[PDB]
């Protein structure tokens, strides 16, 4: 009778693990384009310039 | 005779009894398969991806 059951729980065990990794995957791929984004504009804002001859 | 009854019965319980176990073990072979594959699956997917270099 206890058999059952165990195998059951374990199946929502493994999905319930699945999506929280998906959020921390998934999130790290939407922090991974703005934090490159960020550092090229700010040094190319940094480096350019005109000078008045 | 009393006997006789008391034989007959216990021929049925004996057959109720190995139903009632036949359908925990059928059950048990049906849950095996699809707990193994829920789990590899599932391990699959979250340790794989592509990333762009350039």
Do not use: W
Not at chain 2, 35 to 53: C, D, N, P, R
């Amino acid at each position: 009778a206890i058999g059952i059951g165990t195998l059951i729980i374990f199946i929502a065990m493994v999905l319930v693990a699945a999506v929280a990794a998906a959020v921390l995957i998934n999130t790290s791929g939407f922090l991974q384009q703005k934090a490159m984004a960020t550092g090229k504009e700010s040094t190319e804002q940094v480096a350019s310039g005109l000078l008045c001859s | 005779a009393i006997g006789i009854g008391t034989l007959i019965i216990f021929i049925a319980m004996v057959l109720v009894a190995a139903v009632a176990a036949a359908v925990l073990i059928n059950t048990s072979g049906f849950l095996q398969q699809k707990a193994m594959a829920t789990g590899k699956e599932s391990t699959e997917q979250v340790a794989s991806g592509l990333q762009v270099i350039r």
